Design a protein around this ligand. Sequence first.
Ligand SMILES: Cc1cc2nc3c(=O)[nH]c(=O)nc-3n(C[C@H](O)[C@H](O)[C@H](O)COP(=O)(O)O)c2cc1C
Ligand code: SF4
Ligand code: SF4
Ligand code: SF4
Ligand code: FES
Ligand code: FES
Ligand SMILES: [K+]
Lengths: 213, 263, 44, 431
Amino acid sequence: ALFVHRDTPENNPETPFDFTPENYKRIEAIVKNYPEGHKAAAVLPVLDLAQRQNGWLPISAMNKVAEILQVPPMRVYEVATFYTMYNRKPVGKYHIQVCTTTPCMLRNSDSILEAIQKKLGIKVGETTPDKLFTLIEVECLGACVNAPMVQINDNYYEDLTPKDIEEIIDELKAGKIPKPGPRSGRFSCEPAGGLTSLTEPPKGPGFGVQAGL
Amino acid sequence: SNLIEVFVDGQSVMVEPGTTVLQACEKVGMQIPRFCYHERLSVAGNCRMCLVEIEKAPKVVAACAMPVMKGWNILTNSEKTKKAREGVMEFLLANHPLDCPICDQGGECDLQDQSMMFGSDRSRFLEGKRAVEDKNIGPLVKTIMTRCIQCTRCIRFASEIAGVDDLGTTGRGNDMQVGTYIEKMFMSELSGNIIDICPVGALTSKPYAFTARPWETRKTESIDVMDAVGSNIVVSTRTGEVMRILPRMHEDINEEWISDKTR
Amino acid sequence: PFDNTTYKNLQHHDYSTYTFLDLNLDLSKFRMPQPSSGRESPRH
Amino acid sequence: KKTSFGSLKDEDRIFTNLYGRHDWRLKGAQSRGDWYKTKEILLKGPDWILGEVKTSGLRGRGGAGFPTGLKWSFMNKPSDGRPKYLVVNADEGEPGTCKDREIIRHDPHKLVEGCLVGGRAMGARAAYIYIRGEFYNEASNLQVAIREAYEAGLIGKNACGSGYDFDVFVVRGAGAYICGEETALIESIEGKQGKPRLKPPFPADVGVFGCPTTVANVETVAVSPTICRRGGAWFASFGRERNSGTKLFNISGHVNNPCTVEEEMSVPLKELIEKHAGGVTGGWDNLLAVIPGGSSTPLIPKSVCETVLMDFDALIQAQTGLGTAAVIVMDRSTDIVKAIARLIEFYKHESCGQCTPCREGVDWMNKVMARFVRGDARPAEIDSLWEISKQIEGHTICALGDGAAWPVQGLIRHFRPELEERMQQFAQQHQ
Ligand SMILES: Cc1cc2nc3c(=O)[nH]c(=O)nc-3n(C[C@H](O)[C@H](O)[C@H](O)COP(=O)(O)O)c2cc1C
Ligand code: SF4
Ligand code: SF4
Ligand code: SF4
Ligand code: FES
Ligand code: FES
Ligand SMILES: [K+]
């Protein structure tokens, strides 16, 4: 949790990184989304791309993005250390992120944190010896009505209970892909035990349209 | 022709459009407090020491950044203004280290002086303070970054004046840190100037370190001969010895900067 | 037959690491030419 | 006039695929009435569209609640040579708020159509949809929905066949609540730290890439096509005067059935919780406090919750605000000081650090609130904390600073005896 860089044998400007040819084509499309003369707007998406290819951001990757976009390296470092989704240390294969802000706290997200810690034998902020799971607390993930919820890599797992989360870790260790979403009865954000709205057939085109178009 | 009339504490003054509230106060000889604003740097508006009341406006405005509007009355000394300064000074000093006796800025420090003139006379902060690691940026500027107040003057000067995009802020929140992220030296021919524009003892002259105090120096206004520009300088001496070189403002020559060889 | 009992947003169960950027690459043939500020960058 | 509000009907619900029970892709969206007579709306001109939005009484759904037709009309002016843009705020970062998430993934074509309709009103050439980076799957749904519209001619060149060129770009965030702030969002698009800008200039003059920009919430833009189709008067027939239309509500916390639901504005808070959320856990009598509009709004105790209505003007009178309309419910088992202390901890982690009162003040408030949770303080410190919050409020660059102060003030305003009691317990234990 430090915001200074000290070169180490596995993280220095000579650490091998470079985009694959497939990613170099994705980068071209990213840059075309912005006006000519404002290529620096691509810093966030291109940095994220480097992390998706590599899993984390060595300083060499930051320099590579700076070189590609012709942006001073410090301006890339500033972005990398501001946004919390960028990993400047290697993380596990599965980055478990437990929301602990108040709405999730009110639904016993602490029990979810306990279940993950007891099952994995690690503490918040640590990685397992096998380097499969890294566990952190995060702020509201925009799924508060489905609390308690966690994010693992790109997926949300919601309305959790200590049992449900323990199963998901079993599925990940075994190599399977657990389907995202609520683990209770419901499918998304509707009230449990039956809809209280949107029960009628949706109205079709042209319904209630004002005269004169 | 296009000058507009504004009032500073009820005193009319005619100012060009685009003039900020801070610049309007200057015209009547009132200097608004500031930390992040430097007239030769880009406007930042982040320290909030320049907050000033506009009559009938419920919100204090940042004087350094807010353009004046015709008929505005700036209350530079209202209780609303004075309370804003006290609140900001209190936040500025909450984590600042108790370093004045060992800090080279002592005696010519804008934080000290504005705390005296515009802040409260005591603390109500009952927590532990932040402490930051120092960073080595070369043999000329010593960094004691726990004193930094995150005004970003050094960043803007390095980017705009010196044309070096090496300084920046990393992290965010209370943990936001000014520096180079990596181990880098800020070795520009104009680097030493960031000692002058840093309002606090975060950036100080390494050669000058610990040798004098401001009140005991004699200022000899003189000229630089290290090149052919003829930069106006102040030769600081004490008890018959030259202690340091400072810039002297000359708009048509060196503005308020000197080169590192001159310094 | 109107069915209000099944979740119909199950495609994202099969999204992968490059789905978003692959779609962005796919969309590139549809975009209008970008405007220009007249220089390569503010540093030019 | 109408005197009671609520009991909205499905016939009059804008977001009809709120629960993902129907197809979210173009085929489903069209059958539900999206993209219908979009060409007619575009050929009626910006002044007609802004008038429809002006007459609808729509107010910003992002939190500030600023009237939308008036705000959008700032772009209604001749071009000076720069391009014009509509930035759509899909950051959805306010704790308790998840309404925008359902719109993006289940009704993406309403947002995409809203982008074009609102973009036409402002004369914008494209829309950038800034969606938080943690919504990867929702962002992929949106790009799929955007691709279908491009392939149907509904956007891009000659959009809908109206002779109007409009692009819809999706740009993802990287983890920062402060990038929901309008100007901090713009700096993020430009590839900088998400630090807000001072105003002036206002975005309608100097926005993204230095160009005229309007930042609109996802919900604000998603309902815009329907208001144009069904008319502003239809939308204005809902909710109290100046509090018009249908609102998305998130009821979370200590309810039996936490959910997102669309309900008429000015619905009573009590009715909303009982009707849709199944009521407070342990009975309505087990209610302690409610945060009515997301974490930034001050809480209210059970007594106020009894009769308060859910709209901008009603909640301002209760010394709070509608905010994002995210209702966080706390029953009597809650440690209220701990619950509010966790929100101040959230603002501490989300402050961009740019400006002094929030960079230093919020962290100071967090350190004090942590001691209040344990009672390791003195009663005189309560008034000190109130004064500190007032030094942050109205002195910062952006409204995150105000949003950190208000929860603290709400706790002190309604639960001061709880704070003093905890200090009494701590003092007598170490006595
Ligand atoms: C800290 C902070 C976070 C915000 N987050 C969001 C957000 O996630 N989504 C949003 O629509 N507005 C957010 N806002 C409000 C925006 O600044 C802005 O008022 C709004 O997006 C304008 O859109 P509207 O007029 O349609 O409501 C936030 C404001 C602040 C101060
Ligand atoms: S910077 Fe100023 S206030 Fe801070 S320790 Fe040095 S002299 Fe004292
Ligand atoms: S080091 Fe000095 S000039 Fe730079 S941000 Fe800190 S206080 Fe300001
Ligand atoms: S109030 Fe906080 S988040 Fe907003 S600009 Fe100031 S420091 Fe940044
Ligand atoms: S509080 Fe956890 S998702 Fe919002
Ligand atoms: S001098 Fe104006 S905010 Fe710093
Ligand atoms: K200094």
